[PDB]
């Protein structure tokens, strides 16, 4: 088949049969991701000595606490279900956040 047939009609963001709980899980993952990405840039900017030492500590403390709140919800099993598939996408397209991941490991 050609592309015109393969990509004929619009595909919805979520399957029309997605449960309320499943959708909630994905939305929680979007928030977790935003913290990971945002934190990665903050960590990097701190390495360049462009951020105030107090402001950095407070901001990263807040981001770490928020990350913990999100993770400790959504059955807790259902979030790990997706983590591996997020890694597969990230590896395919070289999406990295290694400074954030290192910080989240410790705190």
């Amino acid at each position: 088949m050609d592309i015109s047939q393969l990509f004929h009609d619009e595909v919805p963001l979520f399957d029309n049969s997605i449960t309320s709980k499943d959708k909630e899980v994905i939305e929680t993952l979007s928030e977790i991701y935003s913290i990971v990405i945002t934190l990665d840039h903050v960590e990097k900017a701190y390495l360049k000595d462009s951020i105030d030492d107090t402001q950095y500590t407070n901001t990263v403390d807040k981001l770490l606490k928020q990350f913990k709140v999100y993770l400790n919800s959504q059955n807790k099993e259902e979030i790990n279900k997706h983590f591996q598939s997020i890694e597969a996408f990230a590896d395919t397209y070289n999406i990295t956040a290694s400074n954030a991941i290192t910080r989240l490991e410790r705190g």
Partner: protein, 65 residues
Amino acid sequence: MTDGLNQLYNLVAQDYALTDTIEALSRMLHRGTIPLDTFVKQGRELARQQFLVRWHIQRITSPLS
């Protein structure tokens, strides 16, 4: 193009615009042009949207690309 191909192209364009905007804010942050609190607020919102755009792209392209 078909509706489907139009949709995919627009999502890829949106992904690139979101990356462009996050990077612009990131450069400002490293430079000191914007406060840390502003980067975090605006940066988090854009990254949130970017996750969902990418989720959407994956849902479309899941037929072995």
